[PDB]
């Protein structure tokens, strides 16, 4: 909370990081080595209780998209991590979602602005932190135009001829606005080799407890970092 | 620089707090002033094309319409700008293509060492 | 407390020595890392 | 005994080796009228 | 100087509402001595306090009053004025200048009225509220008259720059670095200063610079004013006649910026106002010997300031009064002529609601908060003396009734202290004119009486009676869940022996015919600088006594020995006190959205 | 300067007991003659004191007091304050009239400087010390 | 009772006014005097 | 004055005198002469302004025994010697 309400982002400095996948003990000691995209299910470790690797994700890995995507999602799908942040009066939060749609990179801000469009205008509104206009500038370009930039300045010294000019009758200083529309961020993160991917929901039983899980697969891991976000 | 140089009354501040460190270390960057190169020639250009493409975006937001605010067509300057904004859109992308894939780590204690990559 | 100053003096005193400075300053936020020592080739003891 | 010639900004050795510089454990008899003034004067930042 | 500056940005947006002026005012810490609490939790330890200070006005038979202002500052110890006069060198500090034993300083903001019809007297005495003990806080009030002396210092300034400049050009020439540029580009500047001053005087002259403060502040108070200008005027024209009459008749810094900023590479907010010349406003007393240097930005057209002309000077307030105070030979307006009246009237729109006796108000007494709540203290304290009394006189049954846990060994102590009733309302009643009235002035019973009255009589013009913050927290629906217990001692001779009343949780068994009481306690986890005289059982040498009071003035006994007496004295205090004395009280604590 | 809050929530808690308030509880007088006081110096001689204090057997302690139980001194805090519980609870000036208030623990800085046989070095070791420190400084002559 | 505390709120409000009024015209003498310099040099003057 | 003084102190024997000392020790190299240093362009006597020149490390004659430090020569071989030199003449004590 102290890291996050100090309007600091950390996520300019992470990295891409490989998933780990090994099982060893030792006497207060543990290494356990880390797998990227490949065959790692076709190498046949032989070191798993079956045959072939373990491929499982939680619960909360997929959220409902059908109300926006009612069209069929003919084609490869692709796992994107969505990290969004909010921004309000002395309170904050984060929220780590992880996205999977078939739409394009392009179009995931779009989706996700209209998606929180209900607190999309509340950010904007609460952003807001940290006046005359010139009509006459069409009437004014073709004729009677004053234009003694040059002649007026380097052949006076100009100290004392500035009298009328402008004033805006207003005073600002700073306008703060990259900094308080960026609520929307998603990165490319693991790939799936098949289309058609259907999760069943079941129960496990390890450890010394039993908690829900879901079971699924062909999917696997890899990709690189880049952040392309699209504030809004 | 350039605005001291041009102002005739420089601001006292100049550098502030900016000390780049890793895992708590030191860097000792910009210890020179009086250190002059060449290569400021190529820069002068490239900042005053970027200032000059900011005055102009943040002068036709007010030119157009004031939403916010409660012989001479005015269209070369625009097609102009549009114009360099798309050849720098393509200037600026130096997305990267190699990877590093470092084992352990080389310089963990002493930089310089055996270190893995791979062609991703 | 309000004894910065005094504890830096003191500490400026009791460390301004004349043999040698391997460390000493030891500023926040630092690491100061070991030097690198020789090869396999040393002897054997002890400290207290 | 002491050592002479070192100090802080105010007081030197009499504040801080002396003890019963204080004018409180000191003896029922006088002889001015001075007394106040000397403890204003000596304890300035110590509750006057 | 930091916060400060940061939150200057409020004042420069605003526009409109001229009648609010902030400006910078620096309060010498020389006061401090006496205030006897902790410098160190002062500026920065143990945070969650969230010290805070306000400020408000305070006006006289007119009504309303200012909605306070949220400022906040911080103290700076260890020579204050070494670190904000010479600029800041932390990486690079050394033995630099000489000053001597220096102290502390705050800033405070005050709103000030500019307008066509300036005005000026001395009516309006300043509240400000520290968030410290209540028991001698130690604070100030001042009147209108010190906040604006109209004077300023800008003649005794110049010299104080000079002594600093002549100091750090012999800091840079002491050292034998650099390239010999500089040197002689100082050397051709200090000669352009003069041709006859450095060739035949000297170009520096440390003689005896040493950094005091003898004659800046001291003499410079009205030196700058138009007729103090018109007259300089007139002597240099008569001295310019005069030589020319005796003629006929016989018989440029910008290389030592960019030095500055290519040696020091930094910046402090100290410096940039150190170009232009500074205006220093001071207000003494007699209470403690120290200033009020007041500074001001020239840049600006504010008070003080001179950018662009005269500056504003509060004037044609006064010539008008004591030609209509003269008139009649008479000081007192009220007993002047009818055309005096209407001119006084005429001039001076905010005095027509003096004339029409509004609001009526004993003499003009702004600082009445004090005795008020005195005596109110003491009529309620007369008020719940006489119910008990009263209720024991008429107390029916005798010695205990319900059970009470008291043990057999200890019993034999017990009656002896309720067979000293009147003994104990006897020195009760005596101990009104012999303890100290300064323990019982600040306590929590005035501030929670005082909230209880805000219920009624809600502003004449409405409100909902909504604080922001640092407000009467425990007393806002009911009094019912917080209690103030104090315990005082049986005999012949009562004296306070608590400091602060612990809150003690009471509840009622047996839903009718004989009630019976059973203290209980619960478990806070937000502190732990809990007494235990509250948790001390009724034995041991038996007990205290206890009365507490609910959100309805009623007050009921909890005196050990089966007696209990429950009145209301919430109409005692409306027949003694008429509603005519919460005038001020109304005009102070009122707030509304 | 920062563990002491432990410390006091423990003495708190511990439920001591005081005695002779009267002695602690040092009674101010203003504007008052010397009669006066020396009459209610008299008044309290007659009878203020409840209990014999416990602090006067201070003549053979050095073995008398280490050789069997010290309850009272095995509970000595840390050597930057007083150790005593006494009823206080006075202001500045405290009240005139000494009343019977409920017990309670108070402590000083570090002025107390006698405390130096039993938690320092002995007698024997002081004045070891002393004649090592100095060995003569203008003796005199017996007769004089 | 209030008669007292109103009348020390009183000159506790005007000693600041009073001592600053005070203190003001110290140097009205030696303000006078340099105002009338010039007249001395226009007499010396005139003399000449 | 620049800063605080430099050897005043007269209370250092041995490690008081090593430790702390490293100016005051660095210009003592040899027991035939020593070594001071002293602002450049600076005359004996001096004008009144001091000047602003480069200083330059001069050297001090050794033609007496005064530089040489007190705390590396104990004062137990001063009194061993006086004790040898007071063997061979005569010693009147009490009256002087």
Redesign the interface.
């Known amino acids: 909370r102290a890291m996050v309400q100090c309007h600091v982002f950390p996520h300019r400095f992470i990295s891409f990081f490989g998933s780990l996948l090994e099982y060893t003990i030792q006497d207060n000691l543990c290494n356990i080595t880390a797998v990227?995209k490949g065959p790692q299910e076709a190498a046949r470790t032989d070191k798993t209780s079956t045959r072939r690797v373990t491929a499982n994700i939680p619960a909360c890995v997929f959220w409902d998209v059908d109300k926006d995507l009612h069209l069929s999602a003919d084609g490869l799908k692709h796992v994107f991590l969505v990290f969004v942040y909010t921004q309000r009066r002395q309170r904050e939060g984060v929220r780590l979602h992880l996205a999977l749609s078939q739409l394009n990179e392009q179009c995931f801000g779009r989706g996700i602005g209209f998606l929180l469009g209900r607190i999309r205008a509340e950010n904007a509104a609460w952003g807001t932190e940290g006046?005359?206009?010139?009509?006459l500038?069409q009437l004014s370009?073709?004729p009677t135009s004053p234009r003694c930039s040059i002649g007026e300045i380097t052949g006076v010294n100009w100290n004392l001829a500035r009298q009328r000019l402008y004033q805006w009758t207003?005073?600002?200083?700073g306008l703060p606005t990259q900094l308080s529309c960026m609520y929307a961020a998603y990165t490319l993160i693991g790939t799936i080799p098949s289309e058609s991917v259907r999760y069943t929901r079941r129960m496990e039983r390890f450890g010394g407890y039993n908690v829900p899980t879901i079971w699924l697969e062909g999917v696997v891991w890899g990709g690189?970092n880049?952040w392309n976000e699209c504030y809004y | 620089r350039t605005a001291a140089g041009a102002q005739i009354l420089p601001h006292e501040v100049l550098r502030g707090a900016d000390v780049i460190c890793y895992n708590g270390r030191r860097y000792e960057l910009e210890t020179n002033l009086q250190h002059r190169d060449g290569s400021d020639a190529a820069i002068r250009t490239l900042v005053l094309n970027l200032m000059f493409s900011i005055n102009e975006g943040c002068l036709l937001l007010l030119a157009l319409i004031p939403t916010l605010l409660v012989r001479f067509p005015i269209y070369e300057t625009i097609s102009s700008w549009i114009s360099t904004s798309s050849r720098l859109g393509d200037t600026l992308g130096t997305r990267a293509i190699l990877r590093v894939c470092v084992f352990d780590g080389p310089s963990t204690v002493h930089p310089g060492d055996r270190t893995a990559v791979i062609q991703v | 407390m309000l004894h910065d100053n005094v504890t830096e003096s003191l500490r400026r005193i009791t460390a301004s020595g004349g043999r040698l400075n391997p460390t000493e300053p030891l500023p926040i936020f630092g690491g100061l890392r070991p030097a690198t020592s020789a090869g396999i080739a040393r002897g054997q003891a002890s400290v207290c | 005994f002491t050592i002479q010639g070192e100090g802080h900004n105010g007081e030197t050795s009499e504040a801080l080796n002396n003890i019963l510089t204080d004018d409180t454990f000191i003896a029922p008899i006088l002889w001015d009228c001075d007394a106040l003034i000397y403890r204003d004067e000596a304890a300035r930042d110590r509750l006057p | 100087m930091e916060a400060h500056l940061a939150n200057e940005t409020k004042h420069a947006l605003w526009h409109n509402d001229h009648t609010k002026g902030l400006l910078h005012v620096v309060i010498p810490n020389a006061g401090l001595i006496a205030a006897g609490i902790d410098p160190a939790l002062l500026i920065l330890k143990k945070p969650g306090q969230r010290f805070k200070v306000e400020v408000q006005t305070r006006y006289h038979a007119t009504g309303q009053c200012e909605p306070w202002c949220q400022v906040f500052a911080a103290y700076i110890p260890d020579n204050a004025l070494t670190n904000l006069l010479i600029p800041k060198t932390e990486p690079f500090v050394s033995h630099v200048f000489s000053a001597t034993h220096n102290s502390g300083g705050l800033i405070l903001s005050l709103p000030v009225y500019l307008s066509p019809g300036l005005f000026f007297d001395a009516f309006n005495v300043v509240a400000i509220r520290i968030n410290t003990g209540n028991r001698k806080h130690r604070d100030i009030c001042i009147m209108y008259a010190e906040l604006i002396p109209n004077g300023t210092r800008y003649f005794a300034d110049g010299q104080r720059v000079l002594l600093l400049c002549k100091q750090l050009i012999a800091y840079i020439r002491c050292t034998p670095r650099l390239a010999s540029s500089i040197k002689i580009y100082a050397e051709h500047m200090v000669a352009a200063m003069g041709e006859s001053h450095t060739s035949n005087g000297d170009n520096i002259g440390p003689v005896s610079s040493i950094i005091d403060l003898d004659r800046q502040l001291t003499s410079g108070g009205i030196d700058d004013s138009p007729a103090e200008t018109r007259i300089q005027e007139n002597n240099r024209d008569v001295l310019e006649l005069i030589k020319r009459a005796v003629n006929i008749v016989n018989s440029l810094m910008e290389w030592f910026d960019i030095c500055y900023a290519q040696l020091v590479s930094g910046d402090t907010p100290a410096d940039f106002w150190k170009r232009r010349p500074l205006s220093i406003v001071p207000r003494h007393y007699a209470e403690s010997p120290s200033p009020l240097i007041v500074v001001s930005y020239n840049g600006s057209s504010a008070w003080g300031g001179r950018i662009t002309g005269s500056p504003i000077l509060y004037h044609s307030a006064q010539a008008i009064i004591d030609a209509a105070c003269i008139n009649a030979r008479v000081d007192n307006p009220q007993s002047l002529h009818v055309t005096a009246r209407q001119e006084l009237v005429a001039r001076l729109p905010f005095l027509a609601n003096v004339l029409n006796n509004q609001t009526p108000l004993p003499a003009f007494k702004p600082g009445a908060e004090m005795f008020l709540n005195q005596v109110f203290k003491q009529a309620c304290v007369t008020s719940l003396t006489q119910g008990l009394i009263t209720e024991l006189q008429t107390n029916p049954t005798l010695q205990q009734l319900m059970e009470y846990d008291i043990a057999d060994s200890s019993q034999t102590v017990i009656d002896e202290i309720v067979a000293r009733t009147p003994d104990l309302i006897q020195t009760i009643v005596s101990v009104l004119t012999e303890m100290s009235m300064d323990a019982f002035y600040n306590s929590s019973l005035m501030y929670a009486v005082l909230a209880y009255l805000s219920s009624v009589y809600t502003r004449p013009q409405g409100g909902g009676y909504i604080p922001y913050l640092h407000a009467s927290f425990p007393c806002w629906l009911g009094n019912r869940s917080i209690y103030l217990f104090d315990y005082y001692n049986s005999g012949g001779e009562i004296l306070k022996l608590s400091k602060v009343p612990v809150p003690v949780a009471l509840e009622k068994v047996g839903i009718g015919n004989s009630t019976q009481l059973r203290g209980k306690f619960i478990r806070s986890a937000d502190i732990v600088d809990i007494g235990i005289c509250s948790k001390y059982l009724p034995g041991q040498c038996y007990a205290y006594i206890c009365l507490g009071f609910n959100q309805q003035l009623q007050s009921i006994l909890v005196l050990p020995g089966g007696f209990a007496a429950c009145f209301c004295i919430t109409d005692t205090l409306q027949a003694a006190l008429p509603a005519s004395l919460i005038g001020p009280i109304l005009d102070r604590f009122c707030f509304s959205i | 300067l920062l563990d002491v809050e432990a410390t006091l929530v423990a003495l708190r808690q511990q439920h001591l007991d005081r005695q002779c308030y009267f002695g602690v509880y040092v009674a101010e007088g203003t504007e008052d003659t010397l009669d006066v006081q020396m009459g209610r110096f008299m008044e309290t001689w007659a009878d203020m004191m409840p209990h014999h204090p416990h602090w006067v057997n201070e003549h053979l302690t050095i073995l008398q007091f280490i050789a069997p139980s010290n309850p009272r001194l095995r509970f000595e805090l840390n050597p930057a304050f007083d150790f005593f519980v006494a009823p206080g609870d006075v202001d500045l000036p405290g009240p005139q009239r000494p009343p019977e208030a409920m017990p309670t623990v108070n402590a000083t800085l570090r002025i107390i400087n006698g405390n130096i046989p039993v938690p320092l070095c002995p007698i024997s070791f002081r004045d070891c010390r002393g004649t090592q420190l100095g060995l003569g400084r203008h003796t005199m002559t017996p007769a004089t | 009772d209030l008669e007292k505390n109103t009348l020390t709120l009183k000159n506790a409000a005007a000693v600041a006014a009073l001592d600053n009024l005070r203190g003001e015209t110290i140097t009205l003498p030696t303000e006078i005097d340099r105002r009338l310099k010039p007249l001395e040099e226009q007499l010396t003057r005139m003399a000449k």
């Open positions: 990227a006046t005359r206009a010139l009509p500038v370009n073709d207003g005073d600002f200083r690189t880049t």
